[PDB]
Design a protein around this ligand. Structure first.
Ligand code: HEM
Ligand code: HEM
Ligand code: HNI
Ligand code: HNI
Lengths: 141, 146, 141, 146
């Protein structure tokens, strides 16, 4: 469960991300495809190389979903309901992959947020992304 | 990765008693029932709507036999699983787009199926040897991914 | 999410286990220590010799906790509260290990329930053990 | 664990700019903050009760120096990580009783610390090379467990 301090940290960190959320979403995806090639099995229809137009667009979608989760941080199971259904039933992405994108999102945040990515904030963001991942895999079976 | 002579003998002894058809069909069928997201690769197999439908599906049975047949062949190459499965690894990566986590899931389902079939004969040391094998086979099938 | 149908399957299967629970708990631990030797890093203080009375005693405790969880399957976070506290705050077992014990519990059940371990029941028991594991790791951070 | 020549050069170039003592202390501290169950091995280290207590803990910092110093030495032996880390693997198993999952967690924390320190210089291709390294080191440290 996210603590009061976790929620303050997540809101502050994502607040600082600000207008860059879409850029950072695309960067995290790029980092994932390069670092964890098995995740590419889910995107055979995508151009997955650097500067991909599909990846830039998709990163905006991912970022928007995260922004919404931050806005509804006390009701993520419901705020992410449709997206959980999509990943569980249409896409059927193996749950193991959510930790890979989560890690790539943390790395991206670290690379852009020198003052804000303190150990406490890192810890809170990891918990937050774990919680998003848990919600997104809650309807698989 | 590297099996001891005692582990190898335990693997080979059990496998000589395995009905690859029943075990293969049972393992693939249970993979699809227990982890239904794995059905994503098999929509062409037809009716996968209930457990009974999955288990009795002729295409699931045929594919399970084929998969466990290749697994069985792999047991003759316990010291070079990576070499032997190299071709199949590339195929599953590039042509079939199968996440290698699926091999790990199948391996654990296979262990359950062996336990179900053999009962007390599937002792903890026999299980332990099979866990090394299934980990090795999954790793070998994952090894050429890119 | 354990469905009412899962709960039906779990209750029926564990009912059949009956007084063998303690024995199967010990067997599951033995299987885990042999099959997944990294789990032994949590038990360096134990006697892990063949037929260890310490292991057998511990298997009985694991089994009793599961029996309680089955009996309170609608209310597992409450039933397991003290055990969740213990694993989170004292024992501090990495969450990855819960899947290893759960698998060994399934294998044990398979080995002893030829008639009852149908694909549907296998699926329900896997979900149940994953739910137990979720409750036991819920307070870790 | 197969790095390209370009990846090997990028690993070496970045590492030449790393203060190993500092980065080691930071990575071990972040491990104990982010995944607080990992504090279980460090009862003797004193106060670990808050993020600041952990990060500034002199015993944590001293230990991080040792750990990353061994890691750094391993980067000279990328083609033989298993041999390089064999005695440390045996030690962490037989004497220290450290679950090898901890090596995987530390690897990912280290990648975060490198990103944090280097900013834009820690590019997606540089990260990808470090992911290969950190997976290889964790696998090597787990290899002699039994
Ligand atoms: C933090 C975790 C994640 C979030 C917030 C997220 C969010 C999203 C969103 C917002 C969409 C678009 C939904 C729509 O079009 O209606 C999407 C689609 C998709 N996601 Fe995720 N996702 C996550 C994790 C993953 C992971 C780990 C994978 C696989 C490695 C994955 C694979 C996909 C695929 C294949 C699509 C469909 C792409 C297409 O349009 O063809 N997602 N995701
Ligand atoms: C289904 C999941 C699990 C259940 C139901 C369970 C149950 C229990 C119970 C009932 C106890 C005794 C508590 C007491 O004395 O008050 C216990 C203790 C313990 N458990 Fe678990 N446990 C689970 C998972 C794990 C895992 C995965 C590990 C590590 C591989 C583990 C390691 C331990 C250890 C080290 C102790 C303390 C033993 C001692 O020194 O007395 N547990 N567990
Ligand atoms: C859940 C996915 C999945 C898993 C777990 C799996 C596990 C394995 C394992 C593990 C022990 C082995 C040895 C193996 C062997 C094979 N697989 Ni896999 N395969 C999987 C998805 C497939 C798919 C999909 C095909 C194509 C079938 C078809 O319809 O053509 C396939 C085809 C094959 C073929 C046939 C290739 C050819 O045409 O030459 C073999 C042999 N395999 N597969
Ligand atoms: C969270 C657990 C944990 C992790 C992730 C970890 C990860 C690593 C990694 C990974 C890159 C390396 C190369 C490494 C190297 C070392 N560790 Ni690890 N160690 C860990 C827990 C320890 C413990 C515990 C000790 C003994 C500490 C003490 O109290 O003296 C230790 C001791 C060492 C020593 C000193 C050996 C001795 O005392 O003879 C070295 C060197 N290591 N450890």
């Amino acid at each position: 469960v996210l603590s009061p301090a976790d929620k303050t940290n997540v809101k502050a960190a994502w607040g600082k991300v600000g207008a860059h959320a879409g850029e950072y979403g695309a960067e995290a995806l790029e980092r994932m495809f390069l670092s964890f090639p098995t995740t590419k099995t889910y995107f055979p229809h995508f151009d997955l190389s650097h500067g991909s137009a599909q990846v830039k667009g998709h990163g905006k979608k991912v970022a928007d979903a995260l922004t919404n989760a931050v806005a509804h941080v006390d009701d993520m199971p419901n705020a992410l309901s449709a997206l959980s259904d999509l990943h569980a039933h249409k896409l059927r992405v193996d749950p193991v992959n959510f930790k890979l994108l989560s890690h790539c999102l943390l790395v991206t945040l670290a690379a852009h947020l020198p003052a804000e990515f303190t150990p406490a904030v890192h810890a809170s963001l990891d918990k937050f992304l774990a919680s998003v991942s848990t919600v997104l895999t809650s309807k698989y079976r | 990765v590297h099996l001891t002579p005692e582990e190898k003998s335990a693997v080979t002894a059990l496998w000589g008693k395995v009905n690859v058809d029943e075990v293969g069909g049972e393992a693939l069928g249970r993979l699809l029932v227990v982890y239904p997201w794995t059905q994503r690769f098999f929509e062409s197999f037809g009716d996968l709507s209930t457990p009974d439908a999955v288990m009795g599906n002729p295409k699931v049975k045929a594919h399970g036999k084929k998969v466990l047949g290749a697994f069985s062949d792999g047991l003759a190459h316990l010291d070079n699983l990576k070499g032997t499965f190299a071709t199949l690894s590339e195929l599953h990566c590039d042509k079939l787009h199968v996440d290698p986590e699926n091999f790990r899931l199948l391996g654990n389902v296979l262990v359950c199926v062996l336990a179900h079939h053999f009962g007390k004969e599937f002792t903890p040391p026999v299980q332990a040897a099979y866990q090394k094998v299934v980990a090795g086979v999954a790793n070998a099938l994952a090894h050429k991914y890119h």
